[PDB]
């Protein structure tokens, strides 16, 4: 087997690999974006706006387009926030390198030199249009989650849904005192049980143990639930564990399995409520916080499907590190619960990036227009051999908002002509309205995104184009 | 594209190696079997390329130049294809370099332009050597016997063909007038000097022995009129109820043909010639009057009657006058291989001398006609303008080292192309040494030091297996041979490098 | 199982097919070249400039070309680099060797002409050889490092790595072969992480183990100096038997799990400060490590702990045992290090071992964009550290960028006239073949080739042209290339040099390997039954 | 869908081959038709005539080059090159979805501005149009439109033949007479390229089969053109012979022999040593002319005889009789001579009398190279038509440097006219950079460094001063081109005003013709 391409055939085949896919994802951008349908080998279909599963199910005959999926996974693991307005930028580069590549006989390394210089000037623009805001205010993050959920009707439930995640945000945080607000939200698991209402979700600052107690009618209050990290066999062995913990006199019990009848005699004599088996992952949640002490209160609730247990430390220190908790999501229906999970699960990375860079970059196509003007300004100053390739990079950032205009179906020339003045000269808050397809203030309308969204994307997107310019020959069909 | 150029170059590499036995007297024969069942076998690189069949379209460049080199020199012209083939082979890595094919073509343009200046300087006037009218052409004819298959039988034509070319008028030279008739069969030493028209054999029926084959002083008469009874007569309507009037149809032409043969004989012509075939009715009439007649005069036979004989053609028998009749001193008809040859002799007005080539081999007899024809073209351009250069392939070696002297005056990126053209020029003597079995490196190291000291003309003769001067050995070459060779080969190299793609329809 | 092929086809069809494959890999020569995509058919691919990786996965149906592929295996053993650059020299050796064998001279005279030329070629290199000495600071080791960073896409980021690789190799500095400086291979541990940039890498003068603690509640840092460390292979994991009372089998597993529980308790009896366990450890046995201030590590690779016993000098033990039948942990298996500090790079802890005893080691933690980037950076620094290894082992270094091939021109031209006979033509072709390497660089540079080649001949001729004993300058020696401005620049000002081993024992071994192809007369192929 | 895939992919197939067809570096190509005849030429317009093309959009552009041969035909391969670049710029607009109406208006508004800028590019009109000194500036760059092997010989033969092949008069106005047939193309293999010269006579290919005796010194030959063949009056139908007595049978042959004798004797009474016969010659005529020694002419049908109408000046007369001097021409010497190695009929006039025509002997070894010389001869007639037909051809910067300055002028035209078409004009203003891109590709130069240096040499107009250097600036074709930008007037490299005026005018509608095709409907066979 050969499958080798040399000369002009090598560059043409690799550009058209991701070029045809770039036109397919043009409907994935913006709040007006469409919903793509997929075809698996089993004949089924998956209808979603997330481009992560779109490129995975679609099999491209060219191996050059396979890296774009891997390049998409890097942005999903690092950011993974609002892929509607983010992940589409992976295919907006190679499409704009087509006009001059072979026609001018420019060697790819010469283009690589212009690619390295474009990343230097791009890092200064990201933090230039960013503006700081109060990092301790939770009301600023309430309107931020509402921007990415506009693909569904959950805006009516956004009051409970936004506060559902944000209560866990402020709950964790705190991986360092000073130098940066690192956290880990993977310890907080969101359980989705069909049926009920979203208001059934109980979230607050502390460690939420999702399990039940011995009996549902048992006392719901404990003074200081201190945490500590067939019939005949169960009653003897479990008693050697739960009762042995009582040596330090805790009022809270944590076991792997249930409590038998014999253990109930010596467990209830302590004058408190006894908690039976606790979920396995819940022990790792309290292991971060804390023999643990300083537990304020305990509470237990009753509802048909599963039960609840409330454990409130309320004082971590006496510094300390992050706290972990649990979240249960109760949807209205079966098909409604599974579809809305994409917006709520991504809400963890929404506020996580706010703690990283409190500065805020303008959204709604305003960031791409700001970079396109700065790249066009530095092109005439640098000149040299980079004049042609570095100017085309400015047009690459200009076609990104053109994709947002494609949803409306108008003429981008009319809008982009006005954006070269009111935005560049006027202010960085000027952008394209998603709903009305007009030019309005992004901050006044409520469209904005953290700096980490644009910083970790454009920087990764520019570095992702390196593999596209290094292609020479393709060898396949042997082994590995 | 780029691969199409290399494919066109590699297609000519197999031809270059195939033409190695062609050039040079020490080469070997090549068998070419055509659709006529006649196998072409020759040691000369001209006739081979004439009937050579090719396949790839790019080989037509070597076919087109083969017809041009034939009208100029006629022998030893393979060096035109050897140079054009080697320059393309040496330029294969150069095409991948930064030098475009144009600078390579411009390099060959400046190389041939500076070569003509060297050839003009190397041209030596032979009249300053005190060479008489004999030794001038004689030494030039002996050295012209090379490149030909049979050297032994060529020595028999040395003292003859010189007198045969000098028999032709030196003021007006014509190839068709000096044209030579081929006789199949017989030894090469059996040839003769003929001053007049020759016929294949004859076409006769029944007894041919009643006609005298030798006349004393016959009057040569050539006519294009046909003698036949009721041949071209159109269909007519003849209503005859009588006897004699119906019989007079055939008797009218029988009496008319008797008057035609009588009026021609009254002019005194003992030799009657016709164009279209004739019947046997004139046999009895010619046998009793002792008059010989032969028909089917060919195209080459008519041109000899025009100039050499100086006769005339008159169809009307009553219009034939003695002013339209020729003559001659002696008429002799020689028979070879049971085939009689009518031969006109003793014609002082004839400005040409026809040669009779007798040979046993069909492949050799075809080359000998063109072998003597090449010497005719040599004596032609050399007599008008006298220039002598050393033959044997050492003429380019004097220029080869001299081309390196012009490269020192270039001092640029094109010097690599000039040095390549000078190095690729040395393949001609190496292929001549390959057919001789000599070492390639040992002789080439001697060829470079040859012209390095004495300069002038140093030939390195290959017959004695030693180094020497071909000028002292009386080995000469016409200077116009390499002039048209280097000028025409440059355009052949410029045409190949200029074609980036080949389009073929259907 | 097949027919045979003889005649000029073996000297051509086998050589031309090799030239076709050789012309493919020429696009990766030099920093101005490009990299080839190697597809694994599984949906992922690896784009690399390494010649050993490309030629290994490349399908070759001609046995004549398989010998040239095996050159990268023996070259990486003696040299350790050149697959991105030097390996190309074995290509053009057969280019001009084909035109000579197609006319008259038998390949024997041609090869023996190369043998007499290669014998004096080592001395010709020694004449232009510039030893490493009288240089300010690390400029030599920095220039050799930057040369090893050439041909890689991260060569622009080499402004950092150049200073790190020099100090990293000084960390692994040991003494062996009766008082000779040695840099053991694999002693430098290369780690990968996603984040930061290339210039953000950390220089660690010691071993670094990438792993996390067993239990997430265990202490993440152990303070104090002279902390002991040990590597244990102990495994913690869950015949005719007549089952009557379940307490019989329960008593057996109670003793089995009880002894294994004691196996961890016997560790603290010897005073082990740090314990490294190959397999996993239950959360119950981890309690003894917290009270004794021990940092436990589980799920370790056998090759990871083997390098620790070599660098630190501790003795590896499989399980609890001694000279007797009792199962315990002796104190003779404990090592020593300066301090134990846990560095967390992209949610990955690292065990820092400083002040090794048996063998001095170092580590390099690389942080970069993504996988295909770091995956390329692995082979980038793998062959880079071997270049400086041969630099400090033998102080003889030769200029790079086509300087050696340009200088040997006059050396081989004057040597061809000395021998003469029929070997003069072969020597001239061997000199003109080496000039193809800088010509290939101009192909990937999008510039004029012969424009620089005419400068490689002219500017390097002043050496032998003018008398070197009379000085007179007019010769800066090297010159040889520029990869940006397309001008003639000295290598000293450019700072690009390579060890002599990159040429000697490289082309000398390649020339002797390529002449074996010219020796081949016929070819016999037997298809599998 | 037809413009995105079928139209772009089919036109770009032959567009890459046309890049070597323009400029002094123009490269030949080998094209073999369905009949098997090989064709080698450096002119892409000549290629498309014999080339078999399937896709209709390419066939439409072929007719645009045929119209150029009627008017200019000099360097008109840009019509295929420029249209390919205009479609490349339009290809970016097709993917964007820009309306084709705004594209058509982009070329219409630019064509009106382009024709106005051409009137400002004219410098140094040549009003002589006669002597070789003034025509050297015009003819020499036209020679560069073809193979560059020898630019001295081709430029000298055309400049010398002016006083020969072209009509010579004191002052000739009102569209002086010119013809493509004023120069006969004679291809004879053999001989050096320097042996080619201009002969005031005429040469035909044939061998006289008779006794012919050439008259040289005395000259004074009488020649006439005969429509019908030479023989007694012949019946066009098939008759029937009537034979009764012996008088009709014996005198049947004598009747046709004696009448043609007196018929041919009347021609000899006028002192006629040569004739012009469009038809064949009977066998009875050649037999009687052996005594008189009168020539016959076997030349083919009148398409060759049209050249003899100017040379001899004789009116074809069907009847033989005794042609009056009105039908009798004049030729100085008729002799069979050897020029390129073959014996053919040659009319050699030292000082002759000939009307507005002559011939040029072509000497070369390769017959395929002579085919390109024939196309170069048509460029000489095209240079005459370019001077004669319009009031003047003026002068224009050559070597493709004309549109380099036009880019800066049209770019300002888009800025001076704001609107929705402001960005559409700028895309079509820089689309003329393909001309230096096309030539430098075949010049061995890198357009990365060279092209911005061409804009840096011309700048806007000049530095502060009163003068124009940019009119004398152009791309350098030479081995010294790596040094910088060579001038033109020093080498007298010029162009014609009507060359780019007619080419851009046709290419304006030709570019919008392909873009106006919504779908291509085809059918079998």
Swiss-Prot record, chain A:
The keyword Aminoacyl-tRNA synthetase does not apply. Disulfide bonds join 314-325. CDD domains: TCP1_gamma. It is found in: Cytoplasm. One of its GO terms (cellular component) is chaperonin-containing T-complex. InterPro entries: Chap_CCT_gamma, Chaperone_TCP-1, Chaperonin_TCP-1_CS, Cpn60/GroEL/TCP-1, GroEL-like_apical_dom_sf, GROEL-like_equatorial_sf, TCP-1-like_intermed_sf, TCP-1_chaperonin. One of its GO terms (biological process) is protein folding. Pfam families: Cpn60_TCP1. Molecular chaperone; assists the folding of proteins upon ATP hydrolysis. Known to play a role, in vitro, in the folding of actin and tubulin. In yeast may play a role in mitotic spindle formation. Belongs to the TCP-1 chaperonin family. Heterooligomeric complex of about 850 to 900 kDa that forms two stacked rings, 12 to 16 nm in diameter. NCBIfam families: chap_CCT_gamma (TIGR02344), thermosome_alpha (NF041082), thermosome_beta (NF041083). This is T-complex protein 1 subunit gamma. It comes from Saccharomyces cerevisiae (strain ATCC 204508 / S288c) (Baker's yeast).
Swiss-Prot record, chain B:
One of its GO terms (molecular function) is ATP hydrolysis activity. It comes from the Eukaryota. The keyword Nucleotide-binding applies. One of its GO terms (cellular component) is cytoplasm. Keywords: ATP-binding, Chaperone, Cytoplasm, Nucleotide-binding. It comes from Saccharomyces cerevisiae (strain ATCC 204508 / S288c). Heterooligomeric complex of about 850 to 900 kDa that forms two stacked rings, 12 to 16 nm in diameter. It is found in: Cytoplasm. PANTHER family: CHAPERONIN (PTHR11353). This is T-complex protein 1 subunit eta. Molecular chaperone; assists the folding of proteins upon ATP hydrolysis. Known to play a role, in vitro, in the folding of actin and tubulin. In yeast may play a role in mitotic spindle formation. Belongs to the TCP-1 chaperonin family. GO terms for biological process: chaperone mediated protein folding independent of cofactor; protein folding. SUPFAM superfamilies: GroEL apical domain-like (SSF52029), GroEL equatorial domain-like (SSF48592), GroEL-intermediate domain like (SSF54849). PROSITE patterns: TCP1_2, TCP1_3.
UniProtKB/Swiss-Prot annotation, chain C:
Pfam families: Cpn60_TCP1. GO terms for biological process: chaperone mediated protein folding independent of cofactor; protein folding. Keywords: Acetylation, ATP-binding, Chaperone, Cytoplasm, Nucleotide-binding. GO terms for cellular component: chaperonin-containing T-complex; plasma membrane. GO terms for molecular function: ATP binding; ATP hydrolysis activity; ATP-dependent protein folding chaperone; unfolded protein binding. It is found in: Cytoplasm. The keyword Acetylation applies. It comes from the Eukaryota. Belongs to the TCP-1 chaperonin family. Molecular chaperone; assists the folding of proteins upon ATP hydrolysis. Known to play a role, in vitro, in the folding of actin and tubulin. In yeast may play a role in mitotic spindle formation. Heterooligomeric complex of about 850 to 900 kDa that forms two stacked rings, 12 to 16 nm in diameter. This is T-complex protein 1 subunit alpha. It comes from Saccharomyces cerevisiae (strain ATCC 204508 / S288c). The lineage of its organism: Eukaryota, Fungi, Dikarya, Ascomycota, Saccharomycotina.
Swiss-Prot record, chain D:
GO terms for molecular function: ATP binding; ATP hydrolysis activity; ATP-dependent protein folding chaperone; unfolded protein binding. CDD domains: TCP1_theta. GO terms for cellular component: chaperonin-containing T-complex; cytoplasm. Keywords: ATP-binding, Chaperone, Cytoplasm, Isopeptide bond, Nucleotide-binding, Phosphoprotein, Ubl conjugation. It comes from the Eukaryota. The modification Phosphoserine is found at residue 481. Gene3D superfamilies: GroEL, GroEL-like equatorial domain, TCP-1-like chaperonin intermediate domain. GO terms for biological process: chaperone mediated protein folding independent of cofactor; protein folding. Signal peptide: none annotated. Heterooligomeric complex of about 850 to 900 kDa that forms two stacked rings, 12 to 16 nm in diameter. Belongs to the TCP-1 chaperonin family. Molecular chaperone; assists the folding of proteins upon ATP hydrolysis. Known to play a role, in vitro, in the folding of actin and tubulin. In yeast may play a role in mitotic spindle formation. This is T-complex protein 1 subunit theta. It comes from Saccharomyces cerevisiae (strain ATCC 204508 / S288c) (Baker's yeast). The lineage of its organism: Eukaryota, Fungi, Dikarya, Ascomycota, Saccharomycotina.
């Amino acid at each position: 087997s050969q499958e080798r391409t040399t000369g002009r055939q090598a560059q043409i085949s690799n550009i058209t690999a991701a070029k045809a896919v770039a036109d397919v994802i043009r409907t994935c951008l913006g709040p007006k974006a469409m919903l793509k349908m997929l075809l698996d080998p089993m004949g089924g279909l998956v209808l979603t706006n997330d481009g992560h599963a779109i490129l995975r199910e679609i099999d491209v005959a060219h191996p050059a387009a396979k890296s774009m999926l891997e390049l998409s996974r890097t942005q999903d693991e690092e950011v993974g926030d609002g892929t509607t307005t983010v992940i589409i930028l992976a295919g907006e580069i190679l499409a704009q390198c087509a006009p001059y590549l072979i026609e001018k006989n420019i060697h790819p390394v010469i283009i690589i030199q212009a690619l390295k210089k474009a990343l230097t000037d791009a890092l200064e623009v990201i933090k230039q249009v960013s503006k700081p805001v109060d990092v301790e205010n939770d009301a600023a993050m309430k309107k931020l989650i509402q921007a990415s959920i506009g693909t569904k009707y959950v805006i009516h439930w956004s009051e409970k849904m936004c506060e559902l995640a944000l209560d866990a945000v402020k709950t964790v945080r705190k991986d360092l005192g000073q130098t940066f607000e690192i956290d880990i939200k993977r310890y907080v698991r969101v359980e989705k049980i069909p049926g009920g209402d979203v208001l059934d979700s109980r979230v607050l600052k502390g460690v939420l143990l999702n399990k039940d107690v011995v009996h549902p009618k048992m006392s719901r209050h404990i003074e200081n639930p201190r945490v500590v990290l067939i019939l005949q066999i169960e009653e003897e062995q479990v008693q050697l564990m739960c009762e042995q913990i009582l040596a330090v006199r805790p009022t809270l019990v944590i076991t792997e399995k249930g409590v038998s009848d014999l253990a109930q005699h010596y467990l209830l004599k302590g004058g408190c409520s006894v908690l039976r088996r606790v979920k396995k992952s819940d022990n790792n949640r309290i292991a971060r916080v804390t023999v643990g002490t300083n537990c304020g209160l305990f509470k237990v609730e009753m509802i048909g499907d599963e039960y609840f247990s409330f454990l409130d430390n309320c004082k971590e220190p006496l510094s300390g590190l992050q706290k972990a908790c649990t979240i249960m999501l109760r949807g209205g229906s079966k098909d409604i619960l599974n579809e809305i999970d994409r917006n709520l699960q991504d809400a963890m990375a929404v506020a996580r990036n706010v703690m990283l860079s409190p500065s805020l970059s303008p959204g709604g196509g305003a960031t791409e227009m700001a970079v396109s003007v700065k790249l066009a300004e530095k092109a005439k100053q640098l000149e040299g051999i980079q004049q042609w390739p570095y100017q085309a990079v400015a047009d690459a950032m200009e076609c990104i908002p053109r994709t947002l205009i494609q949803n409306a179906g108008g003429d981008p020339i009319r809008l982009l002509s006005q954006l070269r003045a009111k935005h560049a000269q006027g202010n960085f808050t000027t952008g394209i309205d998603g709903d009305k397809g007009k030019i309005v203030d992004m901050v006044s309308y409520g469209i904005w995104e953290p700096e980490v969204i644009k910083q970790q994307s454009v920087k990764t997107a520019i570095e992702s184009a390196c593999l596209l310019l290094r292609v020479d020959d393709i060898v396949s069909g042997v082994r590995k | 594209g780029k691969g199409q150029i290399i494919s066109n170059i590699n297609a000519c590499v197999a031809v270059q190696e195939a033409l190695k036995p062609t050039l040079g007297p020490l080469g070997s024969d090549i068998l070419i079997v055509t659709s006529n069942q006649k196998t072409t076998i020759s040691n000369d690189g001209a006739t081979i390329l004439k009937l050579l069949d090719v396949v790839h379209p790019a080989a037509k460049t070597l076919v087109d130049i083969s017809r041009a080199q034939d009208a100029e020199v006629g022998d030893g012209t393979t060096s035109v294809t050897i140079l054009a083939g080697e320059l393309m082979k040496e330029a294969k890595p150069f095409l991948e370099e930064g030098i475009s094919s144009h600078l390579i073509m411009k390099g060959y343009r400046k190389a041939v332009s500076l070569a003509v200046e060297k050839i003009n300087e190397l041209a030596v006037d032979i009249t300053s050597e005190k060479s008489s009218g004999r030794e001038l052409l004689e030494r030039c004819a002996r050295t012209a016997m090379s490149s030909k298959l049979i050297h032994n039988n060529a020595d028999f034509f040395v003292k003859m063909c010189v007198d045969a070319v000098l028999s032709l008028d030196r003021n007006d030279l014509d190839d068709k007038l000096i044209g030579i008739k081929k006789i199949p069969g017989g030894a090469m030493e059996e040839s003769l000097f003929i001053n007049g028209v020759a016929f294949k054999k004859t076409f006769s029926y029944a007894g041919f022995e009643q006609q005298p084959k030798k006349f004393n002083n016959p009057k040569i008469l050539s006519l294009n009129v046909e003698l036949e009874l009721k041949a071209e007569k159109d269909n007519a309507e003849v209503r005859v109820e009588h006897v004699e009037d119906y019989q007079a149809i055939v008797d009218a032409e029988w009496q008319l043909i008797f008057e035609k043969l009588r009026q021609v004989e009254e002019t005194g012509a003992n030799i009657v010639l016709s164009k279209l075939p004739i019947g046997d009715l004139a046999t009895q009439f010619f046998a009793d009057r002792n008059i010989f007649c032969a028909g089917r005069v060919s195209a080459d036979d008519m041109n000899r009657v025009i100039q050499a004989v100086g006769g005339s053609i008159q169809s009307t028998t009553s219009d034939i006058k003695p002013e339209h009749l020729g003559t001659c001193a002696l008429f002799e008809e020689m028979q070879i291989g049971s085939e009689r040859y009518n031969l006109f002799q003793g014609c002082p007005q004839a400005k040409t001398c026809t040669l009779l080539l007798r040979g046993g081999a069909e492949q050799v007899i075809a080359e000998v006609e063109r072998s003597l024809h090449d010497a005719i073209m040599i004596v032609k351009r050399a007599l008008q303008n006298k220039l002598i250069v050393a033959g044997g392939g050492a003429t380019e070696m004097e220029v080869s080292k001299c081309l390196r002297d012009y490269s020192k005056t270039i001092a640029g990126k094109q010097q690599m192309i000039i040095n390549a053209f000078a190095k690729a020029l040395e393949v001609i003597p190496r292929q001549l040494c390959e057919n001789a079995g000599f070492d390639a490196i040992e002789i080439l190291n001697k060829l470079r030091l040859a012209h390095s000291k004495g300069e002038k003309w140093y030939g390195v003769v290959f017959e004695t297996e030693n180094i020497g001067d071909n000028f002292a050995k009386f080995v000469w070459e016409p200077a116009l041979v390499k002039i048209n060779a280097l000028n025409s080969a440059t355009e052949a190299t410029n045409l190949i490098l200029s074609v980036d793609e080949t389009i073929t329809n259907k | 199982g097949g027919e045979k092929i003889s005649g000029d086809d073996i000297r051509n069809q086998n050589v031309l097919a090799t030239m076709a494959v050789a012309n493919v890999v020429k696009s990766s020569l030099g920093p101005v070249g490009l990299d080839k995509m190697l597809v694994d058919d599984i949906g992922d691919f690896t784009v690399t400039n390494d010649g050993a990786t490309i030629l290994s996965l490349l399908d070759v149906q001609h046995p004549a070309g398989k010998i040239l592929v095996e050159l990268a295996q023996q070259q990486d053993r003696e040299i350790g680099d050149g697959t991105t650059s030097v390996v190309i020299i074995a290509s053009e050796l057969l280019k001009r060797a084909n035109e000579l064998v197609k006319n008259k001279i038998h390949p024997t005279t041609i090869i023996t002409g190369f043998r007499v030329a290669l014998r004096e070629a080592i001395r010709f290199i020694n004449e232009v050889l510039s030893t490493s000495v009288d240089t300010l600071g690390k400029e030599t080791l920095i220039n050799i490092a930057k040369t090893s960073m050439s041909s890689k896409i991260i060569g622009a980021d080499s402004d950092f790595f150049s200073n790190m690789v020099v100090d990293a190799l000084l960390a692994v500095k040991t003494q062996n072969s009766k008082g000779e400086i040695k840099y053991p291979v694999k002693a430098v541990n290369v780690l990968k992480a996603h984040g930061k940039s290339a210039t953000e890498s950390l220089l660690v003068p010691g071993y670094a183990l990438n792993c996390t603690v067993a239990s997430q509640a265990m202490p993440k840092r152990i303070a104090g100096g002279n902390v002991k460390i040990a590597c244990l292979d102990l495994n913690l994991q869950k015949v005719q038997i007549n089952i009557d009372d379940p307490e019989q089998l329960e008593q057996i597993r109670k003793r089995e799990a009880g002894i294994v529980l004691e196996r961890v308790k016997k560790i603290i009896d010897a005073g082990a400060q740090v314990v490294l366990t190959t397999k996993g450890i239950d959360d119950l046995c981890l309690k003894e490590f917290v009270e004794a201030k021990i940092m436990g590590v589980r799920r370790c690779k056998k090759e990871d702990l083997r390098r620790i016993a070599r660098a630190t000098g501790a003795t590896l033990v499989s399980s609890m045992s001694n000279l007797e039948g009792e199962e315990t942990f002796e104190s003779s298996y404990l090592g020593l290090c300066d301090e134990v500090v846990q560095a967390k790079f992209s949610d990955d802890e690292c065990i820092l071992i400083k002040g090794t005893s048996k063998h001095s080691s170092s580590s390099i933690i690389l942080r970069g964009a993504n996988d295909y980037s770091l995956d390329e950076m692995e082979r980038s620094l793998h062959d880079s550290l071997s270049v400086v290894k041969r630099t400090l082992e033998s102080g003889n270094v030769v200029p790079g960028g086509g300087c050696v091939e340009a200088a040997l021109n006059i050396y081989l031209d004057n040597f061809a006239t000395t021998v003469g006979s029929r070997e003069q033509l072969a020597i001239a072709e061997f000199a003109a073949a080496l000039l193809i390497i800088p010509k290939t660089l101009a192909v990937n540079a999008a510039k004029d080739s012969s424009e620089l080649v005419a400068k490689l001949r002219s500017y390097h001729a002043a050496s032998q042209m003018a008398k070197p004993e009379d000085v007179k300058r007019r010769s800066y020696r090297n010159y040889g290339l520029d990869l940006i401005r397309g001008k003639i620049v000295d290598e000293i000002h450019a700072g690009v040099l390579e060890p002599t081993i990159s040429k000697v024992k490289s082309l000398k071994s390649a020339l002797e390997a390529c002449v074996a192809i010219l020796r081949i007369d016929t070819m016999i192929t037997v298809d599998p039954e | 869908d037809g413009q995105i895939i079928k139209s772009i992919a089919a036109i770009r197939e032959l567009h890459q081959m046309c890049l070597t067809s323009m400029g002094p570096c123009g490269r030949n190509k080998i094209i073999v038709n369905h009949l098997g005849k090989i064709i080698i030429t450096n002119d892409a317009a000549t290629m498309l005539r014999e080339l078999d093309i399937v896709h209709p959009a390419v066939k439409v552009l072929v007719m645009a080059t045929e119209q150029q041969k009627i008017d200019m035909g000099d360097g008109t391969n840009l019509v295929m090159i420029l249209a390919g670049e205009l479609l490349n710029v339009s290809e970016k607009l097709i993917s964007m979805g820009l309306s084709a109406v705004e594209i058509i208006q982009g070329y219409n508004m630019a064509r009106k501005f382009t024709l106005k800028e051409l009137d400002e590019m004219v410098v140094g009109e040549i009003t002589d149009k006669n002597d070789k000194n003034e025509l050297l500036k015009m003819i020499k760059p036209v020679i560069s439109s073809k193979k560059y092997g020898s630019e001295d010989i081709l430029s000298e033969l055309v400049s010398e033949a002016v006083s020969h092949v072209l009509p010579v008069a004191q002052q000739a106005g009102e569209i002086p007479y010119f013809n493509v047939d004023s120069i006969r193309v004679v291809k004879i293999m053999g001989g050096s390229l320097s042996n080619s010269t201009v002969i005031k006579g005429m040469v035909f290919n044939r061998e006289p089969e008779g006794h012919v005796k050439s008259l040289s010194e005395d000259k004074k030959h009488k020649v006439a053109v005969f429509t019908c063949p030479l023989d007694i009056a012949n019946t066009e139908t098939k008759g029937t012979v009537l034979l009764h007595n012996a008088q009709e049978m014996l005198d049947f042959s004598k009747g046709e022999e004696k009448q043609i004798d007196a018929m041919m004797k009347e021609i000899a009474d006028m002192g006629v040593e040569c004739i012009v016969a469009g038809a064949g010659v009977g066998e009875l005529a050649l037999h009687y002319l052996n005594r008189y020694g009168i020539l016959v002419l076997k030349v083919p049908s009148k398409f060759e005889l049209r050249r003899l109408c100017r040379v001899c000046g004789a009116t074809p007369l069907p009847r033989l009789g005794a042609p009056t001097p009105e039908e009798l021409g004049l030729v100085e010497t008729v002799k069979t001579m050897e020029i390129g190695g073959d014996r053919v009929t040659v009319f050699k006039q030292e000082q002759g009398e000939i009307s507005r025509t002559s011939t040029i002997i072509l000497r070369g070894a390769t017959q395929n190279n002579l085919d390109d010389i024939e196309r170069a001869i048509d460029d000489g007639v095209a240079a005459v038509k370019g001077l004669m037909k319009p009031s003047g051809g003026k002068l224009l910067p050559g070597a493709g440097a004309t549109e380099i300055e036009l880019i800066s002028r049209i770019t300002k035209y888009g800025e001076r006219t704001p609107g929705l078409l402001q960005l559409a004009i700028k895309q079509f203003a820089v689309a003329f950079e393909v001309v230096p891109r096309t030539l430098a590709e075949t010049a061995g130069l890198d357009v990365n460094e060279v092209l911005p240096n061409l804009y840096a040499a011309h700048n806007v107009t000049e530095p502060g001063a009163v003068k124009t250097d940019h009119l004398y600036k152009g791309v350098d074709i030479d081995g010294e081109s790596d040094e910088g930008v060579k001038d033109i007037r020093e080498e007298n490299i010029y162009d014609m005003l009507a060359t780019k005026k007619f080419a851009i005018n046709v290419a304006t509608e030709a570019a919008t013709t392909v873009l106006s095709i919504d779908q291509i409907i085809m059918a079998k066979k």
